[PDB]
């Protein structure tokens, strides 16, 4: 059965106005800004941007990739697809 989300989990993450996007749950580094309560730090592959999101917008990657893992015209998406498939746990800073 499912656990709660934890750092390292791979997802597609949904933001308003954008397609479900390859992403991961990040850690929070010592001394860095924490997310609001009930939110997770989401790192979006391809764009390499971070946003704070709750579980309602987080779809587990393995279950969802057959629906959401297709190329997309949006800046950074196809790069993101390659990252989540090929090196999802790398440093992208």
Can you tag this structure with a few keywords?
monomer; 93 residues; alpha+beta; SH3 type barrels; five-stranded antiparallel beta sheet; 5 strands; 19% helix; 23% strand; globular; Hepatoma-derived growth factor-related protein 2
Describe the structure.
The protein is α+β, with helices and mostly antiparallel strands. The chain has a single domain, classed as SH3 type barrels (Roll). A 5-stranded antiparallel β-sheet has the order 4-3-2-1-5. A hairpin with a 5-residue loop joins strand 3 and strand 4. The N and C termini lie far apart (33 Å). It is found in: Nucleus; Cytoplasm.
Task: Encode the helix/strand succession as letters.
Answer: EEEEEHH
Please report the distance between the alpha carbons of the first and last residues: 33 Å
**Rg value:** 13 Å
Structural class: alpha+beta
CATH architecture: Roll
Main sheet overview: 5 strands, antiparallel
Strand content: 15-25%
Distinct helical segment count: 2
CATH topology (level 3) name: SH3 type barrels
Quickly name the level 1 CATH class: Mainly Beta
A few lines on this structure:
The protein is of the alpha+beta class. It has 2 helices and 5 strands; from the N terminus they run βββββαα.
Please write out the topology.
Elements: E1 10-13, E2 21-25, E3 40-44, E4 50-53, E5 58-60, H1 61-68, H2 77-86
Antiparallel strand pairs: 1-2, 1-5, 2-3, 3-4
